[PDB]
């Protein structure tokens, strides 16, 4: 299996680089405001109709467009989930949400995360499922790419004051990248047997005397959206292990490619726009080293598995409690690192029921800041804040001034990256601090001992870091959790995007300079060993007491 | 719910009310 474990990652990274290579060539047109060669004036039909005048925007005007989109993107969704009963295509007569669970998911779907604290097929009703979710992941993914495009444009431009047009970005990204590529994947799921219809709930006369009701709905159209846009909120409660969403192992390997289909190609587009490709080919290189290590730990931590299983008289100690036999043990091990290093939120294997080491590493790779091949948009500027830190301490420890991509980096451009990196490990030691004090948050656990502490910690670590992966033993339908996470997901996102647009605002008016004795070559793996020794370090400085009281205490006991 | 419980929380909030104010400025 060790060769099968080695082949599984090495097949996965190799096919990923082949698919993401031309996609990085494609997005480089969109960064430079160069229209795609398929449709050029076809766009100009639409911007006349929408009144989007292709006018340039500074960061204060740019940031209030995205935040204006997301708040407006919530106000429709916050009204749909209340008046869900008044909306068509409901196969049952399902009432609308309670207002706390209305508020939590209305935050959750705008905010690239989709913390589901319910069951969709029991509660959602095919129209807030359709026109409140599938329309919203296509925003939140594009709302991430609109940020990181305004970050890359802040590096390649010289002494301007503008960052493109916001509304032109979002229409190019959705209608030419997010829509048609997800259309090709959604047709692929049905070929292997996913579910996509508008039928009402068909009952089943079983082969035994019992019965069961089957759920239906527009699932396979939604299913290719969230795996592309790193969004994770599936139709069902088994939101990727359910067979209607992932019926074959071949649909799994496309889904795993889908979670890094965009946020790897953004690194290729990063190297192409900035001239030298090696700036991306170290940035790609600095995430795989954390990735390949953190997968092979979890694959080893499941071949070990529970020793109590073989003690009770089973065949082997291989943990198949919280997994799916339709998929592999190693393949559930690969996905659980993939779906938690990449801010996605999909679940093929109930992470609460892993081993102790197998649950620490997904809990680790969120708390790092969601950098290691992270979320669509939110991974790459989540990385580029750490890049502006490891460059910053490097010039601080040589003596000269920091200078990255030719531009000098001053104090105002460094207070902000000290702010944004001190948000997503601030909230998870304020949210988890707030829950573990009170009797509201402690009442919703499932298991005693130090592992039940992780069920509180993994939730807020999947809230401020905007993942959406759930232990789901945590009964999070109480109004305390539904108000805690909705505050932890709003600030953990828009307390990052706002200081990015202040970072990406300030790097535009500056100008690149020549090489010097202060300019490090920011490529080459003699510098990557400084980045990973910083990206892993801020997660180590903030969470080793948070984790040794969690799954490490489970592991030793 | 006591002065040996909640008043330690108010102190640590004040240090973040201090350190962040020390981080916004080059005082």
């Amino acid at each position: 299996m060790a060769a099968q474990g080695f082949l599984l990652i090495a097949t996965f990274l190799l096919v990923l680089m082949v698919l993401a290579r031309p996609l990085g060539s494609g997005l480089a047109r969109l960064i430079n405001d160069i229209p795609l060669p398929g449709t050029t004036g076809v766009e100009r039909v639409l911007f006349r109709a929408l009144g989007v005048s292709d006018r340039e925007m500074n960061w204060k005007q740019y940031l209030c467009a995205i935040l204006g989109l997301n708040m407006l993107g919530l106000a429709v969704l916050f009204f749909m989930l209340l008046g869900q009963h008044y909306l068509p295509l409901n196969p049952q007569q399902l009432p609308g949400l309670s207002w706390d669970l209305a508020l939590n998911t209305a935050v959750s779907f705008v905010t690239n995360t989709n913390w589901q604290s319910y069951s969709g097929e029991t509660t959602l009703s095919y129209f807030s499922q359709m026109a409140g979710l599938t329309v919203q992941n296509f925003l939140s993914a594009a709302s991430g790419i609109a940020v990181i495009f305004a970050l890359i444009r802040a590096f390649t431009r010289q002494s301007m004051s503008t960052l493109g047009n916001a509304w032109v970005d979002l229409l190019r990204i959705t209608l030419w990248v997010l829509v048609p590529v997800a259309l090709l994947i959604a047709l692929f799921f049905i070929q292997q047997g996913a579910l996509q219809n508008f039928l009402p709930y068909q009952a089943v006369n079983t082969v035994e005397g019992a019965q069961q009701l089957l759920p239906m709905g527009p699932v396979a159209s939604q299913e290719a959206i969230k795996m592309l846009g790193t969004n994770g909120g599936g139709f069902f409660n088994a939101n990727s292990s359910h067979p209607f969403e992932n019926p074959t192992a071949l649909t799994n390997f496309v889904q795993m490619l889908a979670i890094f289909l965009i946020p790897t190609a953004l690194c290729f587009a990063f190297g192409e726009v900035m001239g030298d490709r090696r700036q991306g080919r170290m940035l790609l290189w600095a995430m795989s080293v954390i990735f390949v290590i953190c997968v092979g730990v979890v694959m080893w931590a499941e071949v070990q598995g529970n020793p109590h299983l073989l003690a009770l008289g089973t065949d082997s100690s291989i943990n198949m409690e919280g997994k799916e036999s339709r998929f592999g043990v190693l393949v559930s091990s690969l996905f659980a690192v993939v779906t938690t290093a990449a801010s996605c939120g999909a679940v093929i294997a109930m992470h609460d029921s892993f081993t102790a080491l197998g649950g620490m590493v997904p809990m680790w790779l969120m708390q790092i800041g969601e950098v290691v091949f992270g979320g669509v948009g939110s991974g790459l500027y989540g990385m580029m804040l750490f890049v502006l830190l490891a460059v910053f301490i490097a010039g601080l420890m040589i003596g000269r001034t920091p200078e990255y991509l030719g531009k000098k980096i001053d104090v105002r451009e460094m207070k902000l990256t000290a702010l944004a990196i001190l948000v997503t490990p601030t909230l998870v030691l304020m949210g988890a601090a707030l829950a573990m004090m009170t009797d509201a948050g402690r009442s919703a656990m499932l298991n005693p001992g130090p592992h039940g502490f992780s069920e509180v910690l993994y939730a807020v670590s999947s809230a401020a870091n905007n993942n959406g992966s759930a232990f789901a033993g945590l009964s999070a339908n109480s109004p305390f959790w539904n108000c805690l996470l909705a505050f932890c997901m709003f600030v953990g996102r828009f307390g990052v995007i706002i200081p990015v647009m202040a970072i990406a605002g300030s790097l535009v008016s500056k100008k690149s300079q020549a090489a010097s004795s202060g300019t490090l070559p920011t490529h080459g793996p003699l510098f990557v060993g400084l980045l990973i020794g910083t990206v892993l370090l801020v997660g180590a400085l903030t969470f080793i007491p948070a984790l040794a009281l969690g799954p490490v205490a489970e592991y030793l006991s | 719910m006591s002065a040996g419980v909640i008043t330690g929380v108010l102190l640590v909030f004040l240090l973040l009310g201090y350190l962040v104010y020390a981080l916004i400025n080059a005082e």
Binding site: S119, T122, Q212, L250 | -
Partner: protein
């Protein structure tokens, strides 16, 4: 600012991604894949016997027992779609495993002493239709005793319904159960 370009773009993306996109999948779904997109149901005549994806509850002695389910109201309840979220360090899981261990030994007296882990441990989705062939081969002698059938046709029947993946390591060799227990029942006559 905050007017016709700012508002109508969000309206237009609503009209695409909820208007165009799900029905464009739905129209292209039935036009190309009519059986899967409707649900991949199995209907003997007009008797909906469940899909080839879900798995019913199988407590019959002359059937294959699937993986234990542990959904909300009852095992294999597609109104729940949850999973047994019990920790490894939870002793209450060790109660529930020890139930399923001793239940299978009394149910499978002529089988091996060890038990394959898939039959005793639950599934993540709660609706796992599938087990490995090695576990399916372990519960041969109970079923062949009940249905009064021979092994070499039964292993021929299991290999008939053994969905292997495209490569070795993408998944596992997979045995469907609902198609297997229906064809077992049609083989009775």
């Amino acid at each position: 600012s905050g007017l016709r370009p700012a508002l109508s773009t969000f309206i237009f993306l609503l009209l695409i991604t909820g208007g165009v996109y799900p029905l464009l999948t739905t129209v292209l779904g039935q036009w190309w894949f009519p059986w899967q997109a409707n649900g991949s149901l199995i209907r003997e005549g007009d008797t909906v016997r469940g899909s080839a994806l879900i798995g019913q509850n199988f407590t019959g002695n002359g059937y294959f027992h699937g993986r234990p389910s542990a959904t909300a109201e009852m095992p294999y309840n597609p109104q729940a779609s949850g999973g047994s979220n019990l920790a490894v360090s939870n002793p209450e899981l060790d109660k529930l495993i020890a139930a399923r261990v001793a239940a299978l030994r009394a149910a499978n007296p002529d089988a091996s002493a060890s038990v394959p882990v898939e039959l005793v441990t639950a599934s993540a989705s709660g609706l796992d239709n599938n087990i490995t062939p090695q576990a399916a081969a372990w519960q041969i002698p109970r079923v062949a005793k009940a249905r009064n059938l021979s092994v070499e046709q039964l292993t021929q029947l299991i290999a008939k319904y053994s969905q292997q993946p495209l490569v070795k390591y993408i998944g596992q060799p997979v045995v469907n159960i609902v198609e297997l227990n229906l064809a077992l029942d049609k083989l009775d006559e």
